[PDB]
Structure 1
Amino acid sequence: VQAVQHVVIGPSSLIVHFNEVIGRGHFGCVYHGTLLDNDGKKIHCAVKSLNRITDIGEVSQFLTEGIIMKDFSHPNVLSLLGICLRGSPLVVLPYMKHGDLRNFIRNETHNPTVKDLIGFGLQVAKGMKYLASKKFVHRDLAARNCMLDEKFTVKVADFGLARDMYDKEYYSVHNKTGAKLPVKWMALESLQTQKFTTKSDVWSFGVLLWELMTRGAPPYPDVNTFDITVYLLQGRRLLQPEYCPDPLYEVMLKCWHPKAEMRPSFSELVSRISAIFSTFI
């Protein structure tokens, strides 16, 4: 079965600039690339290799699980330009001028305003509302996993064929299942059961909002990965950033409610954030 044949890129249509690495996932590196379009235009692109996973079964399972991203289409969701065969399964993605969202806001030479940062979080909410509408659970939402292109458009990434660990520091590897667990972004019920829902995506989105308002500060810097579960069980949460408006912090606190049902939907989040985005800050 090859439904991937509808997104296959011919080898003579893609040049991978192996001398230019723009990312390092556990499954392989990310390279600068040049893609020849349908209509004969040369576009800058990013090529993600999956050569680090070496098994025909584990290759094919990753492809059919991630090929669904070809059917997704939303301005705040990273798209799939195609895959190449040869060199081991290359995944061709659009190039994002400003890289991942967390690295952009952490760079001092950049001057994002408070309104810029709220707009970034609104864009993530819109992309997640689309994914939740398609009944797709992200399970690894974080600032490091969203991209920022030339037009200041945020793309929810790190899913489907783009799923990987690009920052090993924040992940724990469960020693029975293969699960890679981003401890300090996970909902409390996810730390307890290792199950993920759209409601646990809402929790992680709250942490991402907190990341934006601090311009990339690491969450819970004084709470080790063991004490985090009791810390959350005591009702303690991430504190309000100095330059986070009060209504935005209340949105964050709603995302971290102990009852997964009680948390707002992503559609409710888009409404509350865009309302905050359009008013005086």
Structure 2
Amino acid sequence: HIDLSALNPELVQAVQHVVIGPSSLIVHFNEVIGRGHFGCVYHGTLLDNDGKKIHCAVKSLNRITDIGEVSQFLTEGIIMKDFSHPNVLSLLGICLRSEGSPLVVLPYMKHGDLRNFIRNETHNPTVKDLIGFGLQVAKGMKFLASKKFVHRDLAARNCMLDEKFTVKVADFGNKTGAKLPVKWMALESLQTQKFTTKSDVWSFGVLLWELMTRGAPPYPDVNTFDITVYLLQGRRLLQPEYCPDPLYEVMLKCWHPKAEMRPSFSELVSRISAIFSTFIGEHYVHVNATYVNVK
């Protein structure tokens, strides 16, 4: 009971060559997983004719609450329509029955988010495993940069991990909000709320740190918004105990004060693939006692 067809002429006719028939996809509402706020992600299974099956993630939101921030839901998940990279979260399809709230469907990521996975104490990552995860994000990021796509919120909490341990870059979902992830933000974005690919590089450097500390919160002591004063003092995150020297050097390049002096994602894949190849997988990374329980 909503005059939908009023979204966009040759702009939102996308849900078409992207939609799928419920005649091949079920929904399991009881068992959940996603509920950080909006998009009450569930579970589900799609079908590929007579045999091929598949597990999934289904996130949705409100309804009769007008369409203002409701069209930005369909238009967000559609952003993935042309995101075909092993290291980037993909769009399975789109289906909205003649009475079912705005439904978004994604492939299931068994190991959840990169940050929770690495913080898990029953897991025993090696320096190599972690450098490998960073290399995969760099690869997906290189794809996105190639599309002139600006992420704006690159963080380990926003990367997914599947059953083969393939990292998928994503976004679990304004230039002055408190929700602004200022601790991943480059100096120039904190000052002028402008985001670029060079500002995702700075953020990538912080993600490498989260990786080498196994999900430690950055700048714990400065639990604020006023990180700009702290940074302009001549400060940077410190080298984690298990982070190789050549890798911390890459991090400091990512945090170059001059955005254009920062390496490109293509240079990062290159530099990190080299550092990664030198490891055999005999170095275990342990959790820092002073970061334990720190949020």
TM-score by length of 2: 0.84
Q: 1:215 to 1:178 in 2, by over 3 A?
A: closer
Aligned twin of 1:4: 15
Q: 1:104 to 1:52 in 2, by over 3 A?
A: farther
- Is the contact between residue 116 and residue 157 of structure 2 (CA under 8 Å) also seen in structure 1? yes
In the alignment, the residues of structure 2 paired with residue 53 and residue 260 of structure 1 have an alpha-carbon distance, to the nearest angstrom, of 44
User: Within the alignment, does 1:32 sit opposite 2:32 as a pair?
Assistant: no
- Is the contact between residue 43 and residue 58 of structure 2 (CA under 8 Å) also seen in structure 1? yes
- Is the contact between residue 202 and residue 266 of structure 1 (CA under 8 Å) also seen in structure 2? yes
> What does the per-residue CA deviation read over 1:14-39, in whole Å, with 9 as the maximum and x for residues that have no partner?
22211111112433211111222356
Q: How does 1:106-255 map to 2 (within 5 A)?
A: 106-158=119-171, 180-255=179-254
CA-CA distance at 1:183 after TM superposition: 1.6
- Is the contact between residue 205 and residue 254 of structure 2 (CA under 8 Å) also seen in structure 1? yes
Task: Say which SS state the counterpart of residue 33 (structure 2) adopts.
Answer: strand
Q: 1:178 to 1:237 in 2, by over 3 A?
A: closer
> What does the per-residue CA deviation read over 1:121-150, in whole Å, with 9 as the maximum and x for residues that have no partner?
000000000000000000010000000101
> What does the per-residue CA deviation read over 1:226-247, in whole Å, with 9 as the maximum and x for residues that have no partner?
4311111112010000000000
Q: 1:220 to 1:38 in 2, by over 3 A?
A: farther
In the alignment, the residues of structure 2 paired with residue 3 and residue 238 of structure 1 have an alpha-carbon distance, to the nearest angstrom, of 43
Q: Which moved more, 1:77-86 or 1:136-145?
A: 77-86
CA-CA distance at 1:178 after TM superposition: 6.2
CA-CA distance at 1:68 after TM superposition: 3.3
In the alignment, the residues of structure 1 paired with residue 96 and residue 177 of structure 2 have an alpha-carbon distance, to the nearest angstrom, of 26
| Greater share of strand | 1
**Runs of 5+ unmatched residues, structure 2:** 1-11, 281-295
CA RMSD of aligned residues (A): 2.1
Q: Which moved more, 1:65-74 or 1:261-270?
A: 65-74
Q: 1:65 to 1:21 in 2, by over 3 A?
A: closer
| Greater share of helix | 1
TM-score by length of 1: 0.88
- Is the contact between residue 257 and residue 263 of structure 1 (CA under 8 Å) also seen in structure 2? yes
> What does the per-residue CA deviation read over 1:99-122, in whole Å, with 9 as the maximum and x for residues that have no partner?
000000000101111100000000
> What does the per-residue CA deviation read over 1:171-219, in whole Å, with 9 as the maximum and x for residues that have no partner?
xxxx986684112111111111221111110011011000000001111
- Is the contact between residue 53 and residue 59 of structure 1 (CA under 8 Å) also seen in structure 2? no
CA-CA distance at 1:280 after TM superposition: 4.3
Task: Say which SS state the counterpart of residue 23 (structure 1) adopts.
Answer: coil
Aligned twin of 1:47: 58
Task: Say which SS state the counterpart of residue 128 (structure 1) adopts.
Answer: helix
- Is the contact between residue 26 and residue 52 of structure 1 (CA under 8 Å) also seen in structure 2? no
- Is the contact between residue 60 and residue 101 of structure 2 (CA under 8 Å) also seen in structure 1? yes
- The structure 1 segments of at least 4 consecutive aligned residues displaced by more than 4 Å after TM superposition are 175-179
Q: 1:221 to 1:108 in 2, by over 3 A?
A: same
Task: Say which SS state the counterpart of residue 221 (structure 1) adopts.
Answer: coil
In the alignment, the residues of structure 2 paired with residue 108 and residue 52 of structure 1 have an alpha-carbon distance, to the nearest angstrom, of 40
Q: 1:156 to 1:26 in 2, by over 3 A?
A: same
In the alignment, the residues of structure 2 paired with residue 88 and residue 61 of structure 1 have an alpha-carbon distance, to the nearest angstrom, of 14
Q: How many residue pairs end up in the alignment?
A: 267
Identity %: 100
**Runs of 5+ unmatched residues, structure 1:** 161-174
